[PDB]
Symmetry: C2
Subunit: 112 residues, 2 copies
């Protein structure tokens, strides 16, 4: 498996996030650390929210995936989910269709 | 790894397509077999085109992914590619960001 492929990328991510969780011993220290890099009020998303998202995506990566504009940064979990789900749905659909092609050929050449 | 997860789905697909390729001994027999299930002229996409697409997606699944309206059926390769690439891009981005969170915590608590 090549170094630049999605699957290698998946467990590099999983390794980094697991390391992140070993290191971040007192996660409440991340509350109130701004995302912007120190317009953002009290009560908005911060570094702890982000840390949480990272962990949350990692939980899905680890389960093999079972179904200003830092506001784009937090849409990432939703986007990720959209992508991984539609991959799942495409391959599932195509797996069935490939079976139908195999059956059709067998039929055509009188194997059944 | 659970039976319904993307990764299990990936090599079920790969197994079915590899079986499809063993079975489809004379692929030119698929030319001129209509996709619609026997408005479609001569020169449009047929079962052989579809078979080709299936193989082509399988080549990407096997490389771990390195970067009427049957017309929707053929957009599937492009859609698949869009999805798998943006997954790759999200995890790569987030892998870097998780590293930055780890560094930040170490900094904050004076480990470096």
């Amino acid at each position: 498996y090549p170094k630049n492929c999605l699957l290698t990328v998946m467990d590099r991510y999983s390794a980094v996030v697991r390391n992140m969780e070993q290191v971040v011993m007192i996660p409440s220290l991340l509350r109130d650390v701004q995302l912007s890099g120190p317009s953002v009020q009290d009560g908005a998303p911060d570094l702890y929210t982000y840390f949480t998202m990272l962990k949350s995506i990692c939980v899905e990566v680890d389960h093999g995936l079972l179904p200003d504009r830092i506001s784009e940064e937090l849409d990432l979990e939703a986007q990720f989910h959209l992508h991984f789900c539609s991959l799942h749905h495409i391959l599932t659909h195509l797996t069935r269709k490939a079976q139908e092609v195999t059956r059709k050929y067998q039929e055509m050449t009188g194997q059944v």
